RNA sequence: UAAUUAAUAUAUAUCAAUAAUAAAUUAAAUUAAUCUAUUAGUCAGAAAUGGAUGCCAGCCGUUGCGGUAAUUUCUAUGCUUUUAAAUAU
């Protein structure tokens, strides 16, 4: 369904989320305390049954799930039969 | 309780309810010098806030729903 | 938006952005 | 902290030894602290570290904080550990806790 | 001492004019390749992220599953033509190898083998070969390795599929999914991928890339690094397929609870089968075995193609339900009460005696009365907490919790004015005039309801003169306006809306800078886009609970403000977070 | 330090410190013990 | 070791007499929103009974402080 | 009542994570020695 | 906090004074040099006091009255008051 | 127990006025308000003490 | 626009020239129009859903059972969202209801035929549908023009 | 119950309230401290992760 | 029934009466009236290089610094800050 033969040359790397980051020596702020000192406003998980017209939780979960399945090629070769 | 055990439940934020389960990844400002020091001299122990990261020396990474009581493998 | 798929990651073909002449 | 103490091995001989104080911790309920006097900086570091693993303590986190006041004195240092709505403490004491 | 002996405030490089301009700005010559189509902003030339849709408020994204197809221009999208799903070369490959059974030839057993296999299968005698592998395991091994051997690339060369061709099939398929389709999907995701997502490690990234045969940036240095590190353990140790091997509690396998126990009985009269009769089956503890019974009910229902009772987890866990409702009521929070928040009372050893003789001596006319689901409940409070959630049962059983009645707004008779028309203009004016009464017997919050009570004749009096000059009793809103503002928020069934959140707090308190409010793409607030319906319109009204303002907003302002660290001089109290202000401000003109 | 202030060996139980405060000046003002003999706050 | 961490009298003198309001005794019971009966405080009552603070709070009587033990 | 509101307790330390327990302490979780009868 | 070094501020944060003398004085070892000391006068309740203070300031064209400010310690013993600006 | 309960300027922290009536009779102060020397500094002493503390009766 | 309901031709941003607009706040920035497609289509769907529950849930403004008006209104929304699965399921659910068996709600001719119309004109998962436009160039793959 | 002989079921007999149907994988939500360039986290732009 | 279409009083005082009121990017559902608004550090502890100076001049919250190489003085330039200022009481 809805096929065309497409050549997609560059796919970004695997979303394993763990990649050796870029290294520096000196940094901008030399003040490590800020890490521990920083606070934020409260993240409240839920308000009143958590209803939304844009269905955020479900939709975003599924979209992530999709490219994750894609990149693992549906986890289909990895598991043998125990 | 019948398989793999309970989750290791952490938080960053005010409470368990107010924060995220996620630590901050390696791309943080404060983690880079430390993680560097850890990549280079791997065998000696290293000071830093790079501990609190979701990335570390050990093969077991800290990300949510680690099953830590598992008799794995 | 579709360009991102065909680029080579290290190459930033014109870092300045100015063709000049 | 790092520091320098002179160590007299004889009436002529004088060495420079340094002094380390650190604390090992893991937010998972286990910490420990150590100190040492060694010849080098690296030495006092490694020393104090295996000293801090000798002294490791644990805490039962079922209760998440002390349920009654603990009044106890380290040598000459009078300490109060009491229940609070949140963590309040001097910055260092705070992230030791 | 005083900085200002010897000299005044130093104005030296106060503009810091070396920071003002870069001496190279821009032009009409901006490259059409490396800029936006509009020449608005530079394009970012680093490798593509697959998630980009989450950060940007563009709506075509959400019409396609995988990312590259979201970024596709319409002009290309038109040249994708509708063809049968297996005419898609990946769908072809999938059709050949996975879905086509009959094309699969298995190595033919000899007769020796046939006999040995048979006699192993019917009667087991120990010490024998433990393999004896069923051809179903063989078959599924063959299939899974057909997923190993599948590789992408150009198909005039060896491989069956273009990577783009595979994610094409994938994309058309993910849009094609229904409710239970993507339910089966997410399930299959949680059982296979998700655990792996927890057990991963840098040491696998190369292998993780060997699934799609994609080439990494550092590939050489990762070769060396991962060689040196996998050198430090057994090859068995380090491979990901075997990392999930073992499970706690081998006696009850998830596989065998798939067939639900005695489903041919409690299906037919689910009343005569309280949880007890079943729970005698498992050698586990209480919480675990009720958990399992829930899962049985659900499996069973899904199997018979009917919908399950969603109130069953409330009915089996009823004691826990109410413990939680009441905890939520007591400590004000929404969630599940956990252990640190239990009371520290210490009971005597024999504390249970009264109840123990009450139980030992109880008697029951029939067995249903013995264990019915609702014996947990006596007073009305209980019936109110056990059903707060169904607005059905609650609305029917507690009709007076939604106030339908009120003190009618009535007009007062005016006092006669002897001066006649001469003054008849006077009490007619511009505005409304509210008059609330005070006095020793009135205006105390303690007594508030007695005071607003229509039955009490010492009741606090209000009057309102409308601009035309008549007077009426106060509307109940006006009445209540005259008492110190009052918070009603109750936490027991649905989460009340709480103050000082991400989406609640306006900018200046939340961040110490002005942040633009746009209804799209707030990166700070981790939201993609926002449609803003009217707040309480589309939601159910019982779902509206209240608002809790009753705590300190610690990001903003706290008690006993103090410097964290005195040296260095830079750190303040933890409420002062802020970005650095620059050397003197540069203003770019912004119609663009 | 013979010449100098006595120090506690350990802290004081804060709870107990709050328990000894019941009859203190503030609680007295709230009970209305002292007579109001002058104009007071305006 | 002992079952008694610390045990302290309420008053050093007999010339000092400390009075416990029902609300104070109610504060002791509460550790930041969780009900805590750990520590025990002991009272005289107007009625000559020696009570813990928990019974006292139960019936809302104020009493004279004696000691605290945990 | 209590106004202390278990929802809002705690202090944000910035990036610093910490453990918390859903119910009991994890050591107390698997009881197998009394279950499978491994005890002296 | 040493509250007796402030004796001539008489509870005030800053003071006015008229210049009289300037002599030089040698600080406590191991700090050597010449520290400039200004000998000043001011009046309170028609009493004329001679205040003796450290001169850290900048003197331009000849001027009379200074502004005395408070503490900290200095090399020179017995010097307790300092100079802010000259008028 | 806190600073806010120090401020008696709330009416919620202060023993109410009417007590002084219950002791000395009702509308008893309207007499004292017209007195020649008043409020400089002193006013006719105003007795408000929670009735269960009254030294007289209890 | 699906979001702000302003015309596409004469208006560049969401909430332009609307006095009561949510989408433009004080020092905030302007937001360009959002386009129709599956996203907002099922947004409209979900809103209609919520209203449909609130119709029997609300004490004050609610009806005891669903009126006919509400049924054909919902169905019309589904039709107008090009929402297929939902239309089917809803129809069947309807004829499975109590109101249907009581005789209170009925399926009329208009509902029936609009239902069928939408059944025709949108993609069906396994089959080709009325209102599928043949692409001349699909011969590149299919082989037949 | 009225006469005191009905077996109690109190909140004291209630154990842990179990998670029965496990929610969803919570995917890592991009914050301002997660960026592949050390720029954008610079002191002139970012005050903290959010 | 002087007056309430009033709260406005110009430039004086005493002891009060806390003003850097989004201190920096999308604009004021006005009536557009008052205002043109800046400082600190730069050893320890966020942040340094030249040049002088040489127990001098000077710094000093504090241990203390200054002995021709001063990251602690003076000056120039950059650079540092969690942004109602430093400093004195
Ligand atoms: Mg009983
Ligand atoms: Mg003095
Ligand atoms: Mg000194
Ligand atoms: Mg006080
Ligand atoms: Mg430094
Ligand atoms: Mg200086
Ligand atoms: Mg020289
Ligand atoms: Mg220098
Ligand atoms: Zn719009």
Tab-separated table of N, CA and C in Angstrom, chain E residues 224-328:
chain	number	residue	atom	x	y	z
E	224	UNK	N	37.639	-1.020	18.853
E	224	UNK	CA	38.727	-1.205	19.818
E	224	UNK	C	38.259	-1.201	21.271
E	225	UNK	N	37.500	-0.170	21.633
E	225	UNK	CA	36.932	-0.031	22.973
E	225	UNK	C	36.162	-1.277	23.406
E	226	UNK	N	35.218	-1.692	22.568
E	226	UNK	CA	34.342	-2.818	22.875
E	226	UNK	C	35.081	-4.165	22.820
E	227	UNK	N	36.137	-4.240	22.019
E	227	UNK	CA	36.994	-5.421	22.039
E	227	UNK	C	37.687	-5.539	23.390
E	228	UNK	N	38.354	-4.458	23.794
E	228	UNK	CA	39.060	-4.424	25.069
E	228	UNK	C	38.136	-4.686	26.257
E	229	UNK	N	36.909	-4.166	26.208
E	229	UNK	CA	35.979	-4.335	27.328
E	229	UNK	C	35.291	-5.707	27.359
E	230	UNK	N	34.881	-6.233	26.207
E	230	UNK	CA	34.288	-7.569	26.168
E	230	UNK	C	35.363	-8.616	26.406
E	231	UNK	N	36.621	-8.190	26.341
E	231	UNK	CA	37.733	-9.062	26.705
E	231	UNK	C	37.705	-9.435	28.194
E	232	UNK	N	37.057	-8.598	29.011
E	232	UNK	CA	37.078	-8.710	30.481
E	232	UNK	C	36.023	-9.655	31.056
E	233	UNK	N	35.269	-10.316	30.187
E	233	UNK	CA	34.299	-11.304	30.621
E	233	UNK	C	34.109	-12.430	29.618
E	234	UNK	N	33.383	-13.452	30.048
E	234	UNK	CA	32.966	-14.547	29.189
E	234	UNK	C	32.162	-14.014	27.994
E	235	UNK	N	32.308	-14.635	26.806
E	235	UNK	CA	31.449	-14.255	25.676
E	235	UNK	C	29.977	-14.493	25.982
E	236	UNK	N	29.704	-15.527	26.771
E	236	UNK	CA	28.357	-15.829	27.250
E	236	UNK	C	27.782	-14.672	28.054
E	237	UNK	N	28.599	-14.187	28.974
E	237	UNK	CA	28.274	-13.088	29.858
E	237	UNK	C	27.687	-11.885	29.124
E	238	UNK	N	28.308	-11.539	28.005
E	238	UNK	CA	28.118	-10.228	27.405
E	238	UNK	C	27.107	-10.115	26.282
E	239	UNK	N	26.515	-11.218	25.859
E	239	UNK	CA	25.590	-11.126	24.742
E	239	UNK	C	24.181	-10.913	25.279
E	240	UNK	N	23.386	-10.138	24.550
E	240	UNK	CA	22.116	-9.651	25.069
E	240	UNK	C	20.968	-10.678	25.034
E	241	UNK	N	21.022	-11.656	24.131
E	241	UNK	CA	19.916	-12.617	23.999
E	241	UNK	C	19.682	-13.422	25.280
E	242	UNK	N	20.765	-13.730	25.986
E	242	UNK	CA	20.715	-14.578	27.171
E	242	UNK	C	20.644	-13.832	28.494
E	243	UNK	N	20.517	-12.511	28.448
E	243	UNK	CA	20.506	-11.707	29.670
E	243	UNK	C	19.200	-11.739	30.460
E	244	UNK	N	18.141	-12.245	29.844
E	244	UNK	CA	16.850	-12.371	30.513
E	244	UNK	C	16.540	-13.790	31.037
E	245	UNK	N	17.530	-14.684	30.993
E	245	UNK	CA	17.331	-16.130	31.183
E	245	UNK	C	16.496	-16.605	32.392
E	246	UNK	N	16.712	-16.053	33.588
E	246	UNK	CA	16.148	-16.679	34.797
E	246	UNK	C	15.015	-15.910	35.431
E	247	UNK	N	14.140	-16.616	36.149
E	247	UNK	CA	13.074	-15.947	36.897
E	247	UNK	C	12.886	-16.434	38.328
E	248	UNK	N	12.581	-15.498	39.222
E	248	UNK	CA	12.255	-15.804	40.617
E	248	UNK	C	10.941	-16.579	40.660
E	249	UNK	N	10.810	-17.490	41.617
E	249	UNK	CA	9.591	-18.288	41.761
E	249	UNK	C	9.216	-19.127	40.541
E	250	UNK	N	9.942	-20.219	40.325
E	250	UNK	CA	9.718	-21.099	39.180
E	250	UNK	C	8.468	-21.975	39.212
E	251	UNK	N	7.774	-22.015	40.340
E	251	UNK	CA	6.697	-22.982	40.506
E	251	UNK	C	5.419	-22.551	39.819
E	252	UNK	N	5.225	-21.249	39.712
E	252	UNK	CA	4.111	-20.750	38.939
E	252	UNK	C	4.622	-19.975	37.748
E	253	UNK	N	4.460	-20.561	36.571
E	253	UNK	CA	4.923	-19.911	35.362
E	253	UNK	C	3.800	-19.153	34.716
E	254	UNK	N	4.128	-17.943	34.288
E	254	UNK	CA	3.200	-17.078	33.592
E	254	UNK	C	2.517	-17.798	32.441
E	255	UNK	N	3.262	-18.693	31.800
E	255	UNK	CA	2.757	-19.457	30.671
E	255	UNK	C	1.558	-20.329	31.042
E	256	UNK	N	1.556	-20.867	32.260
E	256	UNK	CA	0.518	-21.811	32.678
E	256	UNK	C	-0.693	-21.164	33.327
E	257	UNK	N	-0.613	-19.863	33.559
E	257	UNK	CA	-1.751	-19.126	34.080
E	257	UNK	C	-2.520	-18.508	32.942
E	258	UNK	N	-2.094	-18.843	31.734
E	258	UNK	CA	-2.804	-18.429	30.550
E	258	UNK	C	-4.135	-19.143	30.460
E	259	UNK	N	-4.126	-20.467	30.587
E	259	UNK	CA	-5.370	-21.161	30.848
E	259	UNK	C	-5.780	-20.759	32.249
E	260	UNK	N	-6.941	-20.109	32.384
E	260	UNK	CA	-7.359	-19.708	33.727
E	260	UNK	C	-7.989	-20.890	34.443
E	261	UNK	N	-7.860	-20.945	35.763
E	261	UNK	CA	-8.247	-22.154	36.475
E	261	UNK	C	-9.736	-22.159	36.762
E	262	UNK	N	-10.372	-23.280	36.440
E	262	UNK	CA	-11.796	-23.485	36.682
E	262	UNK	C	-12.640	-22.394	36.034
E	263	UNK	N	-12.237	-22.010	34.829
E	263	UNK	CA	-12.945	-21.015	34.039
E	263	UNK	C	-14.301	-21.543	33.565
E	264	UNK	N	-14.497	-22.849	33.666
E	264	UNK	CA	-15.754	-23.448	33.248
E	264	UNK	C	-16.791	-23.395	34.365
E	265	UNK	N	-16.400	-22.820	35.496
E	265	UNK	CA	-17.269	-22.771	36.665
E	265	UNK	C	-17.612	-21.349	37.061
E	266	UNK	N	-16.607	-20.564	37.432
E	266	UNK	CA	-16.879	-19.210	37.892
E	266	UNK	C	-17.324	-18.283	36.758
E	267	UNK	N	-17.205	-18.743	35.519
E	267	UNK	CA	-17.838	-18.044	34.409
E	267	UNK	C	-19.339	-18.059	34.605
E	268	UNK	N	-19.851	-19.233	34.947
E	268	UNK	CA	-21.277	-19.498	34.879
E	268	UNK	C	-22.073	-18.956	36.069
E	269	UNK	N	-21.458	-18.848	37.245
E	269	UNK	CA	-22.098	-18.135	38.361
E	269	UNK	C	-21.109	-17.387	39.235
E	270	UNK	N	-20.523	-16.301	38.715
E	270	UNK	CA	-19.371	-15.615	39.320
E	270	UNK	C	-19.620	-15.148	40.750
E	271	UNK	N	-20.879	-15.178	41.173
E	271	UNK	CA	-21.247	-14.861	42.547
E	271	UNK	C	-20.848	-15.937	43.559
E	272	UNK	N	-21.150	-17.196	43.247
E	272	UNK	CA	-20.883	-18.317	44.151
E	272	UNK	C	-19.395	-18.579	44.252
E	273	UNK	N	-18.618	-17.819	43.485
E	273	UNK	CA	-17.170	-17.954	43.485
E	273	UNK	C	-16.428	-16.701	43.932
E	274	UNK	N	-16.461	-16.411	45.239
E	274	UNK	CA	-15.623	-15.358	45.800
E	274	UNK	C	-14.182	-15.767	45.668
E	275	UNK	N	-13.258	-14.818	45.802
E	275	UNK	CA	-11.821	-15.054	45.656
E	275	UNK	C	-11.238	-16.177	46.522
E	276	UNK	N	-11.899	-16.556	47.612
E	276	UNK	CA	-11.337	-17.530	48.558
E	276	UNK	C	-11.200	-18.924	47.974
E	277	UNK	N	-12.321	-19.400	47.437
E	277	UNK	CA	-12.405	-20.701	46.796
E	277	UNK	C	-11.265	-20.928	45.806
E	278	UNK	N	-10.951	-19.904	45.020
E	278	UNK	CA	-9.820	-19.968	44.101
E	278	UNK	C	-8.475	-19.863	44.804
E	279	UNK	N	-8.323	-18.863	45.669
E	279	UNK	CA	-7.041	-18.590	46.318
E	279	UNK	C	-6.482	-19.784	47.100
E	280	UNK	N	-7.313	-20.777	47.425
E	280	UNK	CA	-6.735	-22.014	47.987
E	280	UNK	C	-5.835	-22.763	46.999
E	281	UNK	N	-5.795	-22.314	45.747
E	281	UNK	CA	-5.009	-22.970	44.700
E	281	UNK	C	-3.521	-22.640	44.716
E	282	UNK	N	-3.177	-21.445	45.160
E	282	UNK	CA	-1.806	-20.980	45.020
E	282	UNK	C	-1.068	-20.971	46.357
E	283	UNK	N	0.194	-21.382	46.331
E	283	UNK	CA	0.986	-21.483	47.540
E	283	UNK	C	1.675	-20.176	47.832
E	284	UNK	N	1.113	-19.102	47.302
E	284	UNK	CA	1.693	-17.789	47.481
E	284	UNK	C	1.041	-17.060	48.626
E	285	UNK	N	1.469	-15.824	48.823
E	285	UNK	CA	0.886	-14.973	49.842
E	285	UNK	C	-0.310	-14.220	49.294
E	286	UNK	N	-0.945	-13.435	50.154
E	286	UNK	CA	-2.256	-12.896	49.856
E	286	UNK	C	-2.264	-11.906	48.697
E	287	UNK	N	-1.419	-10.889	48.791
E	287	UNK	CA	-1.431	-9.824	47.802
E	287	UNK	C	-1.120	-10.396	46.416
E	288	UNK	N	-0.112	-11.259	46.350
E	288	UNK	CA	0.241	-11.889	45.085
E	288	UNK	C	-0.904	-12.729	44.492
E	289	UNK	N	-1.571	-13.537	45.311
E	289	UNK	CA	-2.588	-14.428	44.768
E	289	UNK	C	-3.844	-13.663	44.319
E	290	UNK	N	-4.206	-12.578	45.004
E	290	UNK	CA	-5.336	-11.778	44.510
E	290	UNK	C	-4.960	-11.079	43.206
E	291	UNK	N	-3.727	-10.589	43.145
E	291	UNK	CA	-3.187	-10.033	41.912
E	291	UNK	C	-3.409	-11.004	40.744
E	292	UNK	N	-2.976	-12.239	40.966
E	292	UNK	CA	-3.112	-13.296	39.974
E	292	UNK	C	-4.561	-13.573	39.581
E	293	UNK	N	-5.459	-13.622	40.558
E	293	UNK	CA	-6.876	-13.801	40.252
E	293	UNK	C	-7.432	-12.709	39.335
E	294	UNK	N	-7.037	-11.461	39.581
E	294	UNK	CA	-7.404	-10.379	38.668
E	294	UNK	C	-6.957	-10.709	37.253
E	295	UNK	N	-5.675	-11.036	37.110
E	295	UNK	CA	-5.159	-11.368	35.780
E	295	UNK	C	-5.891	-12.538	35.107
E	296	UNK	N	-6.308	-13.522	35.900
E	296	UNK	CA	-7.122	-14.622	35.397
E	296	UNK	C	-8.424	-14.137	34.826
E	297	UNK	N	-9.144	-13.341	35.606
E	297	UNK	CA	-10.423	-12.813	35.146
E	297	UNK	C	-10.267	-12.087	33.820
E	298	UNK	N	-9.235	-11.258	33.728
E	298	UNK	CA	-9.037	-10.497	32.505
E	298	UNK	C	-8.679	-11.356	31.309
E	299	UNK	N	-7.744	-12.286	31.488
E	299	UNK	CA	-7.411	-13.214	30.412
E	299	UNK	C	-8.651	-13.929	29.933
E	300	UNK	N	-9.377	-14.520	30.868
E	300	UNK	CA	-10.597	-15.245	30.561
E	300	UNK	C	-11.580	-14.425	29.720
E	301	UNK	N	-11.874	-13.219	30.192
E	301	UNK	CA	-12.782	-12.332	29.472
E	301	UNK	C	-12.307	-12.035	28.060
E	302	UNK	N	-11.054	-11.620	27.920
E	302	UNK	CA	-10.509	-11.391	26.592
E	302	UNK	C	-10.610	-12.634	25.721
E	303	UNK	N	-10.561	-13.807	26.339
E	303	UNK	CA	-10.596	-15.048	25.574
E	303	UNK	C	-11.988	-15.348	25.052
E	304	UNK	N	-13.003	-15.068	25.860
E	304	UNK	CA	-14.377	-15.355	25.454
E	304	UNK	C	-14.967	-14.198	24.663
E	305	UNK	N	-14.132	-13.210	24.360
E	305	UNK	CA	-14.496	-12.088	23.494
E	305	UNK	C	-15.597	-11.219	24.094
E	306	UNK	N	-15.592	-11.102	25.415
E	306	UNK	CA	-16.520	-10.236	26.130
E	306	UNK	C	-15.688	-9.248	26.914
E	307	UNK	N	-16.284	-8.180	27.425
E	307	UNK	CA	-15.472	-7.239	28.186
E	307	UNK	C	-15.479	-7.544	29.675
E	308	UNK	N	-14.319	-7.364	30.319
E	308	UNK	CA	-14.072	-7.734	31.712
E	308	UNK	C	-14.640	-6.734	32.701
E	309	UNK	N	-14.893	-7.166	33.932
E	309	UNK	CA	-15.323	-6.212	34.934
E	309	UNK	C	-14.117	-5.458	35.440
E	310	UNK	N	-14.142	-4.156	35.214
E	310	UNK	CA	-13.042	-3.304	35.591
E	310	UNK	C	-13.109	-2.964	37.059
E	311	UNK	N	-14.215	-3.321	37.693
E	311	UNK	CA	-14.364	-3.029	39.103
E	311	UNK	C	-13.891	-4.211	39.937
E	312	UNK	N	-13.436	-5.277	39.279
E	312	UNK	CA	-12.945	-6.450	40.006
E	312	UNK	C	-11.691	-6.139	40.831
E	313	UNK	N	-10.700	-5.440	40.241
E	313	UNK	CA	-9.567	-5.049	41.083
E	313	UNK	C	-9.948	-4.175	42.274
E	314	UNK	N	-11.056	-3.452	42.186
E	314	UNK	CA	-11.536	-2.702	43.341
E	314	UNK	C	-12.201	-3.648	44.347
E	315	UNK	N	-12.838	-4.705	43.859
E	315	UNK	CA	-13.600	-5.589	44.730
E	315	UNK	C	-12.728	-6.576	45.495
E	316	UNK	N	-11.652	-7.043	44.871
E	316	UNK	CA	-10.753	-7.987	45.533
E	316	UNK	C	-9.848	-7.269	46.501
E	317	UNK	N	-9.465	-6.062	46.130
E	317	UNK	CA	-8.541	-5.259	46.916
E	317	UNK	C	-9.233	-4.256	47.819
E	318	UNK	N	-10.531	-4.452	48.004
E	318	UNK	CA	-11.406	-3.483	48.646
E	318	UNK	C	-10.823	-2.831	49.883
E	319	UNK	N	-10.294	-3.641	50.787
E	319	UNK	CA	-9.644	-3.091	51.961
E	319	UNK	C	-8.539	-2.108	51.581
E	320	UNK	N	-7.758	-2.453	50.561
E	320	UNK	CA	-6.689	-1.575	50.087
E	320	UNK	C	-7.255	-0.330	49.438
E	321	UNK	N	-8.366	-0.509	48.733
E	321	UNK	CA	-9.033	0.611	48.106
E	321	UNK	C	-9.338	1.664	49.150
E	322	UNK	N	-10.074	1.263	50.174
E	322	UNK	CA	-10.497	2.200	51.193
E	322	UNK	C	-9.339	2.734	52.026
E	323	UNK	N	-8.362	1.893	52.352
E	323	UNK	CA	-7.168	2.409	53.018
E	323	UNK	C	-6.591	3.554	52.221
E	324	UNK	N	-6.592	3.404	50.905
E	324	UNK	CA	-6.016	4.428	50.047
E	324	UNK	C	-6.866	5.681	49.924
E	325	UNK	N	-8.162	5.509	49.710
E	325	UNK	CA	-9.072	6.639	49.668
E	325	UNK	C	-8.920	7.470	50.931
E	326	UNK	N	-8.939	6.810	52.081
E	326	UNK	CA	-8.837	7.535	53.336
E	326	UNK	C	-7.456	8.148	53.580
E	327	UNK	N	-6.392	7.481	53.147
E	327	UNK	CA	-5.068	8.082	53.255
E	327	UNK	C	-5.014	9.355	52.436
E	328	UNK	N	-5.379	9.246	51.163
E	328	UNK	CA	-5.455	10.395	50.266
E	328	UNK	C	-6.237	11.520	50.902
